[PDB]
Amino acid sequence: SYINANTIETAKMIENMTKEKVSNGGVGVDVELITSINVENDTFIERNFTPQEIEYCSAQPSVQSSFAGTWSAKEAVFKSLGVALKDIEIVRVNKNAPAVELHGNAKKAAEEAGVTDVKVSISHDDLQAVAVAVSTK
């Protein structure tokens, strides 16, 4: 009743952020209120998201909660790098962890700080999308 599946997901994400679970790497946490995302504003979605991310998000039950989750994941990954968000691509699969790819200036910026691997976790509900990006050097 009290501990919904969103609070489990976010408590597991913040459990893997502590120094004991992982240390010596770039850590970025971004939250996004889903109400901030406007899916009808096609200029924001085309600018800041890849066509594959838009195709994935549009096929989800809650479209706005998926775009808020992907937007939070891009902003978490950009904070983890520590250096337009279309450069960072998040390939999310059903009942699977999302994977991070860097294409344009983010791919250069990751090589500048000697960042090889970047993982991301996402938890999104009817209020907020929280994303935690851990970048190993």
Side-chain angles (χ1 to χ4, degrees), residues 1-115 117-137:
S1 309
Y2 190 50
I3 308 302
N4 52 345
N6 178 71
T7 290
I8 297 191
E9 287 163 29
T10 299
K12 293 301 294 293
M13 290 177 60
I14 198 74
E15 206 177 23
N16 304 315
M17 185 178 172
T18 51
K19 299 298 182 182
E20 297 198 66
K21 260 70 174 190
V22 69
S23 183
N24 195 355
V27 181
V29 181
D30 194 63
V31 310
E32 290 289 347
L33 277 74
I34 68 165
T35 183
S36 295
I37 304 300
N38 213 49
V39 303
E40 282 159 79
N41 197 47
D42 61 336
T43 185
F44 185 89
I45 301 295
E46 178 50 38
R47 174 176 160 182
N48 281 314
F49 302 79
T50 70
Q52 179 273 321
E53 288 173 320
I54 299 166
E55 182 177 320
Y56 176 79
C57 285
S58 294
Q60 289 301 131
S62 186
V63 163
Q64 189 184 40
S65 185
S66 199
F67 279 110
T70 296
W71 182 235
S72 62
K74 289 164 173 280
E75 287 291 327
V77 164
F78 178 81
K79 275 183 194 174
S80 78
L81 294 176
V83 299
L85 270 297
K86 184 150 69 180
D87 293 316
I88 306 155
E89 191 181 327
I90 306 290
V91 175
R92 200 188 306 164
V93 177
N94 276 18
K95 56 185 297 299
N96 200 359
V100 191
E101 299 195 318
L102 314 177
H103 297 306
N105 304 358
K107 192 166 215 299
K108 188 198 157 170
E111 293 164 21
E112 289 301 317
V115 179
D117 193 72
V118 192
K119 65 172 193 281
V120 68
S121 308
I122 302 167
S123 65
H124 47 61
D125 73 278
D126 71 315
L127 169 62
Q128 67 190 16
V130 187
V132 175
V134 182
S135 66
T136 308
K137 300 150 62 205

